[PDB]
Amino acid sequence: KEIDVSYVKIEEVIGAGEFGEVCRGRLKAPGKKESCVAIKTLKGGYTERQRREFLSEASIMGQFEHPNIIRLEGVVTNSMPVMILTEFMENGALDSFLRLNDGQFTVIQLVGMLRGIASGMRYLAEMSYVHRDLAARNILVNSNLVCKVSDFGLSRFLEENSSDGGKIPIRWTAPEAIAFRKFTSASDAWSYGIVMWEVMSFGERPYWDMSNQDVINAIEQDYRLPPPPDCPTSLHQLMLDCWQKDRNARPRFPQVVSALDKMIRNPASLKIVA
Ligand SMILES: NS(=O)(=O)c1cccc(Nc2nccc(Nc3c(Cl)ccc4c3OCO4)n2)c1
Ligand SMILES: [Mg+2]
Ligand SMILES: [Mg+2]
Ligand SMILES: [Mg+2]
Ligand SMILES: [Mg+2]
Known part of the structure; x- marks a missing residue:
């Protein structure tokens, strides 16, 4: 228009x-x-x-x-x-917004943010759109704390094109997507687990100071990010589900939304923390 x-x-x-x-x-x-x-x-x-x-x-x-x-x-x-x-979107990017507001939103609020992201992704997956750069920095937040997916583009990553879209965002990207360049809604579910981690950590950097190659090697060697401080174990488990090496074992987005909706309905379940 x-x-x-x-x-x-x-x-x-x-x-x-x-x-x-x-x-x-x-x-x-x-x-x-x-x-x-x-x-x-x-x-x-x-x-x-x-x-x-x-x-x-x-x-x-x-x-x-x-x-x-x-x-x-x-x-x-x-x-x-x-x-x-x-x-x-009055509050801008989610990672920066959460860092500003570190420890200042409740677990239920954080889960509601995660649910909105997962609903956006549910829709994109239904529309056969693969995001490929799903990261908290690409989630925008309005005055009512509603979270919305941003950053749209279909250009191949630089690694995909000629020998001689930008670079693959290694820390957010599923191992098979890094290794083979197969981007699917299931590789987006991996990225979504990373977003969950970013949210429950109030915007910390996934994998802290690890290099991109350190990250690739760690994930291949079974390492997964640990629960952020005060993170409900049930949320960490959903993260782990998203980070299964076998992409077919990861939850699809309708399942992700359901799980989050259950948590909101059953807040007592969020009290168990490591
Ligand atoms: N908290 S604040 O008011 O300082 C602030 C700062 C930056 C962006 C904000 N909202 C913000 N709201 C909506 C979109 C947006 N960036 C943006 C994207 Cl990501 C994609 C395409 C597009 C865009 O603007 C129009 O076209 N940004 C808000
Ligand atoms: Mg993109
Ligand atoms: Mg991008
Ligand atoms: Mg781009
Ligand atoms: Mg912290």
């Missing part, structure tokens, strides 16, 4: 993306009430390939409609700067 630039007001620069600024603004279109939007801008000096890659995120977002997937409002393509407008 092409948006008349007269309908957009940019208020403030709030971040930086791959190709430019991320801004907060207002969208007001005839017959609709004004709303808050995030706006990515692309200014002068990029190649047409770069323009296409930038706008591809909009094309992909626009294929989806789900409360846990970032909503596209529209694009500005007949004018400079080129823009992508989405719903505005």
Whole structure:
């Protein structure tokens, strides 16, 4: 959906993306009430390939409609700067948000965040979309703490293309995906276990200071991340389920959502901690 630039007001620069600024603004279109939007801008000096890659995120977002997937409002393509407008997520990226708020949300709140992410992923999997970069940094959080999946793009990773999309995010990536480049919803479930860990640790770095090769070797040698401090054992177990080496043994996302829904219904179960 092409948006008349007269309908957009940019208020403030709030971040930086791959190709430019991320801004907060207002969208007001005839017959609709004004709303808050995030706006990515692309200014002068990029190649047409770069323009296409930038706008591809909009094309992909626009294929989806789900409360846990970032909503596209529209694009500005007949004018400079080129823009992508989405719903505005007041609290930004989940990893940074949790680090700011370390120890300040309850286990039940954290599980609700995890449930929203898992519902987004359930939907993407149903739509046969493999995310491939599922990480807390790619989860955006609104004022009501609703978590939504972001970062959409279909470009192959640099390792997949010519001998001579960016690099595979090793610490989030399932071993078979690293080894063979087979990305599936089941490799996303692995990544989701890593997101669970990031959430229950209030945004700590998966595998701390381990190198990417250290991580690859550790996982092959049966190492798995330990329960974060105060983490309910049942959540750690679901993490371990996501991190099975055999991808077919991992839970699919409907199962992940169910498990989380049970926990919310049965909060006493969350009291068991190592
Ligand atoms: N807490 S804060 O107000 O300082 C802040 C900072 C950065 C981003 C925020 N929300 C924020 N909300 C929605 C989206 C977004 N970034 C973004 C992505 Cl990830 C993809 C595509 C796109 C985007 O903006 C429009 O087009 N960001 C909020
Ligand atoms: Mg991606
Ligand atoms: Mg990415
Ligand atoms: Mg990317
Ligand atoms: Mg801590």
